[PDB]
Structure formats: C-alpha cells, structure tokens
Design a protein around this ligand. Structure first.
Ligand code: HCI
Ligand code: CL
Ligand code: CL
Lengths: 203, 207
C-alpha cells in the first residue's frame, strides 16, 4: 500500500544479491512507501524487531529468539577463503581447509559479532583444528583488507567476491561444503500491508 | 634487541582508509621486514583514532587530516586520492564517462552519520556545495561498503574515494566528477615526540 517500512540487514548480508534486489523490487512496485534502511548485526537487528524500531530484517538464523519470530529461510551461499595473493596456496584451484591450520584467522569480534564467526569455527573444527585468533576487526571490509596486508586468512560468504581488493583472492574449500545461512525475520503477528508486500517481493 | 626488532606496535586505520593501497602495503612491508613485533591492528574513525593516540592506547593511525585538535599530533600527509561518484547501473547518468555534480541536486544521497565520518562527509557537502546545492540526504548507514550496496538498490547516489572501485558490487558503477576536483586526503598520525623504535621504523616503511 503506502506508508513506512523499516528494513534491516547485516553488512555482510547486504552483498548477497537478494538483499538489494528485494529493496529494488519493492522500491519499484511501491514507490510511495517511505523506506527506512538500517545496518547492524544479527543480535542487534533482533532487538529492534522486539522493541518495534524495525519491521523486517535480513539476518542469520540460529540466534537466541528464532522461535518468537517468523523466520523465512532465504538462501545458502557457500563460504570461500580469503587469501593473500602472495600466499603460495593461492595457486590452488580449491583449498583444503586443512592446509590453513598454521595460519592466523582474521574474524569478527567474538562479542557482538556472533554471526558467521560461529559458522567459521564449526566448519573449521571439521577440518580437525581450531583457528588461532589473529586480528579482530568488526567489519568484513577491513577483514578482507587485512588479508591483503598478509595478516592472516578468513572464511567469508561467496557473495564477498564483489570486494575485489587488490592482493586478495577468493577460493572455495574442497575439503567440505561450508555454507552461509540467511533468513528473513519478522514478528509472528503483523498486519502491516506495507510489510506484507515486502515478504512477497522477497520470496 | 630493542631496536625495533621485537615489541608491540598498535596501528589504527579507518574503514575507508583501509581500501587505499598504502595502508595494506605499508603493513605487509613492515611485517615482512620485522616479523617479530606483535602488530595490534584496529579500526576507528579519525576522531576516535586521534583520541586513542592522545590517551596512549594507540601508537600510529591512518586517518584523514583536518580534524579539530590535529595540531597536537605529528601528521605526515600521505598521497591524495580523487573522490568518484557511485551510482546504480540503471541510472541514466551512468552512460556518461564523467558526471557533473549539479546533475544530482534533487537526487537522494546515501551518506553516513557525520560522527562516523567527518572529512569524507565534509568533502561531499563541500563538493555539492560548490555545485550549488545541499545534497538531499536519503539514508544514512555506518560502513561505506553499505552505501555501495544500498546504491545497488537504487536508493540514491553517493560519493566515495577512488579506493572503493575495488567494491565491485553487481549493479553499481563509478564515474569521476568533471565539473570540480574532489579529493580524499590521508595522513599518518602519531604522537609528536614518541621515540618508540618500532613506531619510527614503521614511519620509514610508510613514507
Ligand atoms: O575514513 C572514513 O571512514 C571516513 C573519513 C573520516 C571519518 C571520521 C573522521 C574524519 C574522516
Ligand atoms: Cl617526525
Ligand atoms: Cl609541524
């Protein structure tokens, strides 16, 4: 219809084409709706849904509260490896996650950064080891730039390939099939026509 | 032994600054040539990084000059860099190789909170200010990366450093500004009189 709609997403989720593609499709079909967009991590985006300062969110499932919200599983992209071009393993078409047992891992801060981190370590432990914590920077951008500086490595969703930083390469892992999970989140009982049309343009 | 071969150096940099090739390049060079120093890297906006320099929780920073209180620190001006226009592929102005800023006087602009960004925000307003308008503030997001993803959603336009060409997001292109010459300055800030050897060797690898 027409009105306001507060849409949230994680910075890493925004690269996933389904996030700007849904905002594009909704902006075109309902150009009178006042869109108000927000960026934030999974837990903070959930607190806004609870309090009411947000209507729908592109977040990662598994957070503590997925029962009291309506969760629409969206897509599953694979997790690739960020490698410095100077690294000798960059020549490999596919990397065994086992090969990076002796490298530092630049990941999200262990605290509010609860998304993806837990997915890296779970896929990483399956290769039979636990990554030593390298540098902890709260943004994917700086994670990828810090790999360019030869400060370590990391695992990122395949949608991170759009960050074409000179000096880094993106290679999938052949040992396993790690994936990044995304979900559409909104409260269980919402009657907003402006919101309703959004889940319909997403799905 | 205490000649900078070993020890701890804390380096700071802003989000946008990291994309510039000087920041990563300097770090690897220092790392390569001084493996045994514990590098403690961290991100922050220029205001936060400078305060960390003054308070002693940070040894050197890659920040943007001009911030208030910068005369208290030693600033080595790094290489300047032009500011390009970001816009969706579907934008009709994307067909041009160079864009005039007066073209987008009513176009919604996708900027960032002035608190998270002082200089780049100032450069944007000052550029459009010379173009003869104040930018229609559309949405505000915290990381720059996110304005490029939001510009992919046709939610407006924005102006970012030329380093962000590396953000090759499907649906956005970058075209330089033709009617003016916006720029994005970068400096290396440290304490005037910090004689930490590890710090001094680091300045050598930057300049
Ligand atoms: O580099 C940035 O991320 C924005 C530039 C900036 C940020 C904060 C203060 C001055 C300049
Ligand atoms: Cl000096
Ligand atoms: Cl001086």
């Amino acid at each position: 219809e027409s009105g306001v709609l507060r849409v949230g997403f994680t910075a890493s989720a925004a690269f996933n084409s389904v996030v700007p593609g849904a905002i594009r499709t909704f902006k075109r079909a309902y150009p009178d709706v006042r869109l108000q967009l927000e960026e934030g991590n999974t837990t903070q985006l959930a607190d806004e849904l609870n309090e009411g300062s947000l209507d729908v969110a592109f977040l990662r499932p598994g957070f503590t509260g997925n029962e009291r919200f309506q969760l629409r599983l969206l897509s599953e992209e694979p997790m690739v490896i960020v490698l410095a071009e100077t690294h000798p393993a960059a020549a490999c078409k596919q990397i065994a996650l086992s090969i990076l047992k002796d490298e530092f891992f630049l990941l999200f801060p262990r605290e509010i950064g609860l998304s993806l981190y837990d997915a890296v370590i779970k896929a990483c432990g399956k290769a039979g080891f636990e990554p030593k914590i390298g540098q902890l920077v709260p943004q994917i951008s700086s994670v990828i730039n810090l790999v360019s500086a030869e400060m370590g490595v990391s695992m990122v969703p395949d949608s991170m390939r759009q960050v074409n930083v000179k000096g880094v390469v993106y290679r999938p892992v052949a040992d396993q099939m790690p994936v990044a999970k995304l979900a559409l989140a909104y409260r269980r009982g919402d009657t907003s026509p402006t919101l309703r049309n959004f889940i319909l343009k997403v799905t």
